[PDB]
Amino acid sequence: EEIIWESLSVDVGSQGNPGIVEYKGVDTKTGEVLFEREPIPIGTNNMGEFLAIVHGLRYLKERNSRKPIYSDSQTAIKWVKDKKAKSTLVRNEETALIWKLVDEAEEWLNTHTYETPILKWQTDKWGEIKADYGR
Template sequence: SELSEAQLKKIGRPNYNSISVDAASSGNPGIMEYRGVDTKSKKQLFKQGPFAQGTNNLGEFLALVHGLSFLKKHDSDRIIYTDSRTAISWVRKKTCNSKLERNAKNKPVYDLVDRAVQWLKENEYETTIVKWETKAWGEIPADFGRK
């Protein structure tokens, strides 16, 4: 569904004082990876994976927490964009509600998830998390381009 001129105007342009995070999973569950990039230049700032088994939601969650910890470590005032409402809600609740059952194949992913949840519980952060407006701006700059 296309946005009207008025809607586009109201949404405005992305804030380029930001980083963008995204995940890709081939199959659900399937091989999963995630990364964070500078929103303006698309320069890759971090990347994890590919992991043998994960889901898009797990990847989006890990990408968002990795981004928060990256910005905190660099004492950055940048905002962070994600196109995942699920990841935003899991981060707010400091939890991960994945339905994927833990097994040997996805242990590396769940080890990172456990660390991410622990990080959220132990750290304060000032970073503003913003939903990327895909309909207005196109795919998020961190997108893996596999659609």
């Protein structure tokens, strides 16, 4: 119904899918960029969306912040809830990096606690999520 302006919004961007993947997190209220991941040579949209949420969780926990996270990704929200990124991407030498980060993100989820609400950004009603790459 109502946007929770006191929140962190995350989103993936890519060049190709599979292709070059990056992600960022922004203050929903101001659009200030709070973190940005160095481009990863090969990954999928959903792997990047998953990493972005998990990085948001870690970012907020380190800062003792109870703010929620907005994501526009039905897939990644579920993967985080399950603590399991069910990606179809082949595991080979050229995808090793993204899969290492995904495996490490799952490992973090399985060794830490959080209460952060992970909320669906309602693009149809509210427009593009504030972290969108506008591509």
